[PDB]
């Protein structure tokens, strides 16, 4: 259980490090783009719709990262509490187990 939890935590961290690194890159991109939006006189609405579209693409990035964190926690929980007669219906979870 020790080495397994250790390897699981490191993996779950590698996923978090990625999410953070990726989300800062997309934000810096939006800053560089909103800079060009004010460089050339742009309608206040046009400037904000680019932010809305940018804010929404960020939520997608964090959500997709959250889904993998939950799937990983589902694997570890299922395995530690694992007991005979338990029923597994995922089959993609089962394959990973």
From Swiss-Prot:
Q: Where are the transmembrane segments?
A: none
Q: Which domain of life is it from?
A: Bacteria
Protein family: Belongs to the RNA polymerase beta' chain family.
| Subunit text | The RNAP catalytic core consists of 2 alpha, 1 beta, 1 beta' and 1 omega subunit. When a sigma factor is associated with the core the holoenzyme is formed, which can initiate transcription.
Q: What does this protein do?
A: DNA-dependent RNA polymerase catalyzes the transcription of DNA into RNA using the four ribonucleoside triphosphates as substrates.
Recorded protein name is: DNA-directed RNA polymerase subunit beta'
Source organism of the structure: Mycolicibacterium smegmatis (strain ATCC 700084 / mc(2)155)
Phylogenetic classification of the source organism: Bacteria, Bacillati, Actinomycetota, Actinomycetes, Mycobacteriales
Q: Which residues of the full protein are shown?
A: 148 to 244 of 1317
């Amino acid at each position: 259980l020790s080495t397994l939890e250790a390897e699981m935590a490191v993996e779950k961290k590698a996923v978090e490090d990625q999410r953070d690194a990726d989300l800062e890159a997309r934000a810096q991109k939006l800053e560089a783009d909103l800079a060009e939006l004010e460089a050339e006189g742009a309608k206040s609405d046009v400037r904000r719709k680019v932010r809305d579209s940018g804010e929404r693409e960020m939520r997608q990035l964090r959500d997709r990262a959250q889904r993998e964190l939950d799937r990983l926690d589902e694997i570890w929980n299922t395995f530690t509490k694992l007991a005979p007669k338990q029923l597994i219906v995922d089959e993609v979870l089962y394959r990973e187990l």
